[PDB]
Specification:
6-stranded antiparallel sheet; 264 residues; alpha+beta; homodimer
Chain lengths: 264, 264
């Protein structure tokens, strides 16, 4: 209802999907302080045609889970991973015909970085089904292009609301780890506050430099806010960006968390 | 008003702003095809503290227009320029205390490229007020992070409306010239259509691959659309991005242009 909400994943016919994530967990700053060096976000964007290989999607997904997903633990990494396998519904054995892996993940500590370098030594480039390779890439960086909605939602259980104002701001980060350490932590600490000396400086930092002044009136009139931090991964090659289908946004139900029913 | 609408940030207090652009001109694909030289988008992001120099904002704005804006003609360039000057409101002369130039522009013809290279040799690095220099930079490329709003606007003359759905999609372009040639032209040609075989394939191309299907219902229910194509200029240095405060969006007042008063 309120808090972090993940967008629904892509719907497709005759597909087994496995989805694994701990990104809903709040950033734990005490844990991330144990990483003392920058490390790039790891990106997987792999797919392949399996037609004729006589694999089942159970085999495909179990093998990917064994060489990738089960090696990335929620206690060492923040990750969001989506593994798809399409099958031939008309094939008497319903063999797989394709698969895809989409993932981003970040080591959370220096020890996690150590583990990661050993995992990569073993599995980067792993041959998947003699069709493609498990290629784990370094994102060069990430551009967050963040949208803010402020408005009045009559019915909190439904999607429509009266949009009063929309703003965009854009920031470059070295990694999704830094996004979580700096931006996501601050959303939790100050975006869900009705203390004016918390939320308005939050607006000045992330929306625009005097947004606190502009939004005081707007927050008094509003009861519902959203932040959509679109994460645009900047890859090494010129012109190569990656935006995962794995999205999240923040809904702020002021009407339910504050006595005055509004956001200030 | 509908079509391209400029959306600068709310003007800071005690500021003189001049805004110059021909970007509201629709793309003419036949004219744009006459350019054979790929050229990067030109970027100006200049600012300086003028406190104590006893300049008026008129002095500032006229000097900038003489060495910059007047030199970039709308018949050789597509440009968008915002020149700001803050003044000391309590100073009896209200002297200037700061200024900024924000601009992006593209040569429209091979001859315009010729003029540009000569203009740059003369004026790149020009001394502005013994405080900073006029620097024109090459954008490496542009990431467009485009937002779509669809909803129900009761009163077309005011801002609020009932938001039904929002989507983001992201694209890389080499230049703003390419953005206008590919995306902006298509906005004019198909987004401003109530032909389902025009607008819904537009959605399939630019929003997401089956957006026509999902939006069919929503466009029948909606009467108001917006596209916010945020242009994130990627500069040469790693981690260096530029977003101008000069934004534009496209409003589509389906109530004013279509017989059944809705977007389909």
């Amino acid at each position: 209802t309120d808090g972090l909400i993940f967008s629904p994943l892509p719907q497709n016919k005759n597909t087994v999907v496995r989805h694994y994530s701990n990104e809903q967990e709040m950033p734990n700053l005490s844990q991330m302080a144990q990483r003392t060096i920058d490390f790039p976000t790891q990106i997987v964007r792999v797919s392949g045609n399996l037609t004729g290989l006589e694999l089942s999607c159970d085999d495909v997904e179990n093998e990917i889970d064994q060489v990738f997903s089960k090696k990335i633990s929620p206690n060492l990494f923040t990750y969001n991973t989506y593994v798809s396998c399409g099958y031939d519904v008309n094939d008497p054995e319903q063999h797989a015909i394709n698969f895809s892996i989409q993932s981003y993940f970040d080591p959370l500590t220096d020890n996690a970085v150590d583990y990661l370098k050993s995992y990569l030594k073993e599995y980067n480039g792993y041959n998947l089904f003699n069709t493609t390779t498990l290629q784990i890439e370094n994102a060069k960086g990430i551009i967050v292009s963040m949208n803010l909605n402020a408005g009045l939602k009559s019915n909190p259980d439904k999607t429509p609301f009266t949009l009063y104002r929309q703003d965009r701001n854009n920031f470059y980060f070295k990694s999704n780890f830094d996004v979580r350490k700096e931006l996501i932590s601050d959303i939790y600490q100050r975006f869900y506050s009705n203390d004016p000396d918390m939320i308005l400086p939050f607006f000045d930092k992330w929306i625009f430099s005097y947004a606190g002044s502009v939004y005081y009136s707007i927050l008094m009139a509003s009861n519902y806010l959203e932040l959509q931090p679109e994460r645009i991964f900047v890859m090494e090659n010129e012109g190569d960006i990656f935006v995962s289908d794995l999205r999240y946004y923040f809904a702020n139900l002021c009407m339910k968390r504050n006595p005055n029913k509004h956001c200030l």
